[PDB]
């Protein structure tokens, strides 16, 4: 999961 | 303190206010031909006003919330409920049912501090309901970044906007309310959002909102809700919208949802990962898990743009699709390491942004 | 092993039949039939499905919940094609494909073979009545292991169920139109529940077969088998009060609502309420350690001598909720004797509640 950015 | 009121005029108010031991009690006040009922947890407060059309006597007390509600709710349709203070007890009578409840003094009931309204507007109840239900699911669940556990309420132009995000996915919804508003943003804690939503009965009664520097208040019919706000720097939704998406997909919402739901069955139970393969007018969804089990779904869609492969937490996608109560969905993409924007094909009032898995 | 079956023909069987292999379902294709079996080693459910479409014989086991969830998640009317491939079971329908991990059919546990000693047929509705009337009074996880289940007793032409937790008792007796030997067995509570949910409210007769240590129930396409509780059940006859000569009769719902309100101010642990019975009148009182008090007075039919008695209100409410009838009779003796409660219009179900000195 990537951090939302 | 004495009042006599029909059950039907007490029930809804008790329900609304009832959802240090004294915090488990409701404050009851008879004054000027009105019964007031208050409930609080120190952070937030709900007050209902009930007109007293029968003989009544002024005074205040505090009684167990659940027990008083349960008694009134247990009484039959059309019951009249007579209440009076006797000693350190509150007596409740209806028909030949009698109850004596324990009390705590009204002077001991906590009062929230007074504060000044800095921003005010009115809007339809259904507009607030739309705003909250559109975004509530994207709020964080007990994140150590406390501001993410609440909901941003932003005024800009004549629009009221809600934003919710947990650092992985985000929901934003904006609605016009026909009033010149200052540009302002506050964060409402999760318990406040639940209550704000609960007080929406589904009727003509419009909402009046008042925002202070550390508090928010909502007036609906004969109900007044007040909550503290949350401090912290809430994410800016504008940052995370795909800037100039070159890839657009359109598909039936229910079809898409059912395929994602089936594929999810064979996804990792903890990590929930699915893979999307987009190609001209086709979407393929795959899932596999540590037990080497595999799902594949293939769907007809409308897609122009280059072919690409992108990973997602299937729960985040399903949450969005379930929140979109509509026929067709639009997804806007950039590349496999960037966020996807998901919207109702027929409305731009709400947008959903989900960051992929590598 | 190969079969193609309509979704809807699998769903009820899968529902009914639902060490890692205990999380799997045994599937067998033989003689034009798909069989499905689930087990927990104590009990087993077998469901049969007719195979109208082409099929190939063989057997395997597959995860129950995943296979069920996939089948349920496919669209209504879907044709579901299954076949084995290596250590995997392949499931295909439309453009949905799933590969599930299997475990060998030869490792799926069998219950030991046993001989039927007593047998009878009855309508499903009769067995549903017998269980529903008494199930709620079975014990949960009690060290007295023989209470964690339900007595099934045959005498004359009636089948009787008895359940008790050592405190309150329920008994229900129904004629089944066959002369029966005098016999009784204890069915484990989990078995009672599974047997109950196998009954589909239909026209299929229920065939029961009882062995020394096992019970089997078969209805249409389903066969349930369970171990019995190897123990001694208490005699219900000794619990029933003798010639109670003080019958109170009242509307079931009115009586229930009066007890439910009074229960609010009863002791949370021991739940004692008092009854004062007099000529066509009942008064119910309750109080708790905080000295809160409830009183209910209502009209009933009663012509016996005046008397007082206490009961656990939770037990009384359990009985009234189970009765779901128009009128109830409470058969009373005195302050130091149990009460027997029945539907005023039928002696088929009876309930015993012990007296409390409050
Ligand atoms: Ca009283
Ligand atoms: Ca990017
Ligand atoms: Cl928007």
CSV table of N, CA, C and O in Angstrom, one decimal, chain B residues 256-298:
chain,number,residue,atom,x,y,z
B,256,UNK,N,-19.3,-4.0,-11.7
B,256,UNK,CA,-18.0,-3.8,-11.2
B,256,UNK,C,-17.9,-4.3,-9.8
B,256,UNK,O,-17.0,-5.0,-9.4
B,257,UNK,N,-18.8,-3.9,-9.0
B,257,UNK,CA,-18.9,-4.2,-7.5
B,257,UNK,C,-18.9,-5.7,-7.3
B,257,UNK,O,-18.2,-6.2,-6.5
B,258,UNK,N,-19.8,-6.4,-8.1
B,258,UNK,CA,-19.9,-7.9,-7.9
B,258,UNK,C,-18.7,-8.6,-8.3
B,258,UNK,O,-18.3,-9.6,-7.7
B,259,UNK,N,-18.0,-8.1,-9.3
B,259,UNK,CA,-16.7,-8.8,-9.8
B,259,UNK,C,-15.6,-8.5,-8.8
B,259,UNK,O,-14.9,-9.5,-8.4
B,260,UNK,N,-15.5,-7.3,-8.3
B,260,UNK,CA,-14.5,-7.0,-7.2
B,260,UNK,C,-14.9,-7.8,-6.0
B,260,UNK,O,-14.0,-8.4,-5.3
B,261,UNK,N,-16.1,-8.0,-5.6
B,261,UNK,CA,-16.6,-8.8,-4.4
B,261,UNK,C,-16.2,-10.2,-4.5
B,261,UNK,O,-15.7,-10.9,-3.6
B,262,UNK,N,-16.4,-10.8,-5.7
B,262,UNK,CA,-16.0,-12.2,-5.9
B,262,UNK,C,-14.5,-12.4,-5.9
B,262,UNK,O,-13.9,-13.3,-5.3
B,263,UNK,N,-13.7,-11.5,-6.6
B,263,UNK,CA,-12.3,-11.6,-6.6
B,263,UNK,C,-11.7,-11.5,-5.2
B,263,UNK,O,-10.7,-12.1,-4.9
B,264,UNK,N,-12.3,-10.6,-4.4
B,264,UNK,CA,-11.9,-10.4,-3.0
B,264,UNK,C,-11.8,-11.7,-2.2
B,264,UNK,O,-10.9,-11.8,-1.3
B,265,UNK,N,-12.6,-12.6,-2.5
B,265,UNK,CA,-12.7,-13.9,-1.8
B,265,UNK,C,-11.3,-14.6,-1.8
B,265,UNK,O,-11.0,-15.2,-0.7
B,266,UNK,N,-10.6,-14.5,-2.9
B,266,UNK,CA,-9.3,-15.2,-3.0
B,266,UNK,C,-8.1,-14.2,-2.9
B,266,UNK,O,-7.0,-14.5,-3.3
B,267,UNK,N,-8.4,-13.1,-2.2
B,267,UNK,CA,-7.3,-12.1,-2.0
B,267,UNK,C,-6.7,-12.4,-0.6
B,267,UNK,O,-7.3,-13.0,0.3
B,268,UNK,N,-5.5,-11.9,-0.4
B,268,UNK,CA,-4.9,-12.0,1.0
B,268,UNK,C,-5.8,-11.4,2.0
B,268,UNK,O,-6.3,-10.3,1.9
B,269,UNK,N,-6.0,-12.2,3.1
B,269,UNK,CA,-7.0,-11.8,4.1
B,269,UNK,C,-6.6,-10.5,4.8
B,269,UNK,O,-7.4,-9.7,5.2
B,270,UNK,N,-5.3,-10.3,5.1
B,270,UNK,CA,-4.8,-9.1,5.7
B,270,UNK,C,-4.6,-8.0,4.8
B,270,UNK,O,-4.9,-6.8,5.1
B,271,UNK,N,-3.9,-8.2,3.6
B,271,UNK,CA,-3.5,-7.2,2.7
B,271,UNK,C,-4.5,-6.8,1.6
B,271,UNK,O,-4.4,-5.8,1.0
B,272,UNK,N,-5.4,-7.8,1.3
B,272,UNK,CA,-6.6,-7.5,0.4
B,272,UNK,C,-6.3,-7.1,-1.0
B,272,UNK,O,-7.1,-6.4,-1.7
B,273,UNK,N,-5.1,-7.4,-1.5
B,273,UNK,CA,-4.6,-7.0,-2.8
B,273,UNK,C,-5.2,-7.6,-4.0
B,273,UNK,O,-5.3,-8.9,-4.1
B,274,UNK,N,-5.7,-6.8,-5.0
B,274,UNK,CA,-6.1,-7.3,-6.3
B,274,UNK,C,-5.3,-6.5,-7.4
B,274,UNK,O,-4.8,-5.5,-7.1
B,275,UNK,N,-5.3,-7.1,-8.5
B,275,UNK,CA,-4.6,-6.5,-9.7
B,275,UNK,C,-5.6,-6.2,-10.8
B,275,UNK,O,-6.4,-7.1,-11.1
B,276,UNK,N,-5.5,-5.0,-11.3
B,276,UNK,CA,-6.4,-4.6,-12.4
B,276,UNK,C,-5.5,-4.5,-13.7
B,276,UNK,O,-4.5,-3.8,-13.7
B,277,UNK,N,-6.0,-5.1,-14.7
B,277,UNK,CA,-5.4,-5.0,-16.1
B,277,UNK,C,-6.4,-4.2,-17.0
B,277,UNK,O,-7.4,-4.8,-17.3
B,278,UNK,N,-6.1,-3.0,-17.3
B,278,UNK,CA,-7.0,-2.2,-18.2
B,278,UNK,C,-6.4,-2.3,-19.6
B,278,UNK,O,-5.2,-2.1,-19.8
B,279,UNK,N,-7.3,-2.5,-20.6
B,279,UNK,CA,-6.9,-2.5,-22.0
B,279,UNK,C,-8.2,-2.0,-22.7
B,279,UNK,O,-9.2,-1.8,-22.1
B,280,UNK,N,-8.1,-1.9,-24.1
B,280,UNK,CA,-9.2,-1.3,-24.8
B,280,UNK,C,-10.5,-2.0,-24.5
B,280,UNK,O,-10.6,-3.2,-24.7
B,281,UNK,N,-11.4,-1.3,-23.9
B,281,UNK,CA,-12.7,-1.8,-23.6
B,281,UNK,C,-12.8,-3.1,-22.8
B,281,UNK,O,-13.7,-3.9,-23.0
B,282,UNK,N,-11.8,-3.3,-22.0
B,282,UNK,CA,-11.7,-4.5,-21.1
B,282,UNK,C,-11.0,-4.2,-19.8
B,282,UNK,O,-10.0,-3.5,-19.7
B,283,UNK,N,-11.6,-4.8,-18.7
B,283,UNK,CA,-11.0,-4.8,-17.4
B,283,UNK,C,-10.9,-6.2,-17.0
B,283,UNK,O,-11.9,-7.0,-17.1
B,284,UNK,N,-9.7,-6.6,-16.5
B,284,UNK,CA,-9.5,-7.9,-15.9
B,284,UNK,C,-9.1,-7.7,-14.5
B,284,UNK,O,-8.2,-6.9,-14.2
B,285,UNK,N,-9.7,-8.4,-13.5
B,285,UNK,CA,-9.4,-8.3,-12.1
B,285,UNK,C,-8.8,-9.7,-11.7
B,285,UNK,O,-9.4,-10.7,-12.0
B,286,UNK,N,-7.7,-9.7,-11.1
B,286,UNK,CA,-7.1,-10.9,-10.5
B,286,UNK,C,-6.9,-10.8,-9.0
B,286,UNK,O,-6.6,-9.7,-8.5
B,287,UNK,N,-6.9,-11.9,-8.4
B,287,UNK,CA,-6.6,-12.0,-7.0
B,287,UNK,C,-5.9,-13.3,-6.7
B,287,UNK,O,-6.3,-14.3,-7.4
B,288,UNK,N,-5.0,-13.4,-5.8
B,288,UNK,CA,-4.4,-14.6,-5.3
B,288,UNK,C,-4.0,-14.4,-3.9
B,288,UNK,O,-3.8,-13.3,-3.5
B,289,UNK,N,-3.8,-15.5,-3.2
B,289,UNK,CA,-3.5,-15.5,-1.8
B,289,UNK,C,-2.3,-16.5,-1.5
B,289,UNK,O,-1.8,-17.2,-2.3
B,290,UNK,N,-1.9,-16.5,-0.2
B,290,UNK,CA,-0.8,-17.4,0.2
B,290,UNK,C,-1.1,-18.9,-0.1
B,290,UNK,O,-0.1,-19.6,-0.4
B,291,UNK,N,-2.3,-19.3,0.0
B,291,UNK,CA,-2.7,-20.7,-0.3
B,291,UNK,C,-2.7,-21.0,-1.8
B,291,UNK,O,-3.2,-22.0,-2.3
B,292,UNK,N,-2.1,-20.1,-2.6
B,292,UNK,CA,-2.0,-20.2,-4.1
B,292,UNK,C,-3.3,-20.3,-4.9
B,292,UNK,O,-3.3,-20.7,-6.0
B,293,UNK,N,-4.4,-19.9,-4.2
B,293,UNK,CA,-5.7,-19.9,-4.8
B,293,UNK,C,-5.8,-18.6,-5.7
B,293,UNK,O,-5.1,-17.6,-5.4
B,294,UNK,N,-6.6,-18.7,-6.7
B,294,UNK,CA,-6.7,-17.6,-7.8
B,294,UNK,C,-8.1,-17.3,-8.2
B,294,UNK,O,-8.8,-18.2,-8.5
B,295,UNK,N,-8.4,-16.0,-8.3
B,295,UNK,CA,-9.6,-15.5,-9.0
B,295,UNK,C,-9.3,-14.7,-10.2
B,295,UNK,O,-8.3,-14.0,-10.2
B,296,UNK,N,-10.2,-14.8,-11.2
B,296,UNK,CA,-10.0,-13.9,-12.4
B,296,UNK,C,-11.4,-13.5,-12.8
B,296,UNK,O,-12.3,-14.3,-13.0
B,297,UNK,N,-11.6,-12.2,-13.0
B,297,UNK,CA,-12.9,-11.6,-13.5
B,297,UNK,C,-12.5,-10.8,-14.7
B,297,UNK,O,-11.6,-10.0,-14.7
B,298,UNK,N,-13.3,-11.0,-15.8
B,298,UNK,CA,-13.1,-10.2,-17.0
B,298,UNK,C,-14.5,-9.5,-17.3
B,298,UNK,O,-15.5,-10.1,-17.3
